Design a binder for this molecule. Structure first.
Ligand SMILES: Cn1c(CCC(=O)Nc2ccc3ccn(CC[C@H](CO)n4cnc(C(N)=O)c4)c3c2)nc2ccccc21
Ligand SMILES: [Zn+2]
Length: 349
């Protein structure tokens, strides 16, 4: 069955939304936290969506389940270990996984997230434990894995710590900074704390992506490219509403991190219309296909491949092309990136 039975690369999935029902049930059982249920069965149904909803309804599900992992070392490392596992099972041979370290912390972070009480699990420590689990997981399951730390739109006060974290754990497994959250917050791309993190990212050679043009305007994409200097875009769909920016980004070979099934469920893409990625396939744009939050969207990577193959007539050699384009726009050392590409061009023959 699976739409594209071949090796894959994925650049855009978030750890905190790539968590198995059963491990959430586990941890908060053992924690006293509790949940809108206690089978890892009915759990999936309530956290998963089948339908667009508002942002509030979206965020409150991080509020049921986050409190179960966040704070608990064991649970941080574990979720990252078995993240890699999921990807092995998608046939992925390289994945960049992203998250905010503050959002799993319980100590040395204000405000403290998720109505947690203060503990002594700090963000820097978060990174450490994530690292271990992905690294150990790379070892056990045969998928090359790096990670990306997210600043969050609404709290520019955390972004200098993000970049510093990026520089300290640099490719142990951190390779890039990201900007995630509510991208409609008025002027958020230009908050000095964000701007100055991304400038220090240029100064110290840390790679840069930015979620933009998902649910914001094409002015948000422009700000990500021109001011934050990003190298790739998260989603970027609304780029198409500004033609000269579109055309320049095609000429510059900008990579767009597309998340198709994501884009139905979040409202990004409105189903009476054109999918965005269809335009990009016809224009030979540099983009990849990605899942974002499989937990929440009920999905695996094959989901997004089936959607494009079935609803959009994507073909095998288009799936090949974009995975090559994903590996080319990855944030690895150039030596490792060529090694990637060799693996894949071998598999595709
Ligand atoms: C508008 N909209 C967005 C756009 C993205 C958005 O606003 N996200 C957002 C906003 C504020 C917060 C505050 C915390 N988070 C979660 C952070 C974590 C960090 O790794 N995370 C995990 N997944 C996402 C994501 N898909 O946006 C972000 C936020 C995430 N996501 C939606 C999903 C269902 C329905 C509507 C949606
Ligand atoms: Zn995302």
């Amino acid at each position: 069955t699976p739409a594209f039975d071949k090796p894959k690369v994925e650049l855009h999935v978030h750890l905190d939304g790539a968590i198995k029902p059963e491990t959430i049930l586990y941890y908060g059982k053992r924690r006293g936290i509790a949940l809108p249920a206690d089978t890892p069965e009915e759990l999936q149904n309530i956290i998963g969506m089948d339908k667009p909803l508002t942002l509030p309804d979206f965020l409150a599900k991080f509020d049921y389940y986050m409190p179960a992992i966040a704070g608990c070392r064991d649970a941080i490392k574990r979720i990252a270990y078995e993240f890699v596992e999921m990807k092995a099972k998608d046939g992925v041979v390289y994945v960049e996984v992203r998250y905010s370290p503050h959002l799993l912390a319980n100590s040395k972070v204000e405000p403290i997230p998720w109505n947690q009480a203060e503990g002594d699990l700090t963000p820097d420590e978060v990174v450490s434990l994530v690292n271990q689990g992905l690294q150990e997981g790379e070892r056990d399951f045969g998928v090359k894995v790096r990670s990306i730390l997210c600043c969050m739109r609404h709290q520019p006060s955390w972004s200098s710590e993000v970049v510093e974290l990026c520089k300290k754990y640099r490719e142990q497994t951190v390779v890039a900074i990201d900007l995630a959250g509510d991208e409609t917050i008025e002027g958020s791309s230009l908050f000095p704390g964000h701007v100055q993190a991304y400038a220090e990212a240029v100064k110290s050679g840390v790679h840069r992506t930015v979620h933009a043009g998902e649910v914001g305007s094409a002015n948000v994409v422009k700000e990500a490219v021109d001011t934050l200097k990003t190298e790739r875009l998260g989603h970027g769909y609304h780029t198409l509403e500004d033609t000269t920016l579109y055309n320049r980004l095609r000429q510059e070979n900008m990579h767009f991190e597309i998340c198709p099934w994501s884009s139905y469920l979040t409202g990004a893409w409105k189903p009476d219309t054109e999918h965005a990625v269809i335009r990009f396939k016809n224009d030979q744009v540099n983009y990849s296909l990605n899942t974002d939050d499989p937990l929440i969207f009920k999905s695996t990577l094959d989901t997004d491949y089936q959607m494009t193959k079935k609803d959009m007539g994507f073909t095998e050699e288009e799936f090949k092309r974009l995975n090559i384009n994903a590996a080319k726009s990855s944030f690895l050392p150039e030596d490792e990136k060529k090694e990637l590409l060799d693996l894949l061009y071998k598999a595709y023959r």
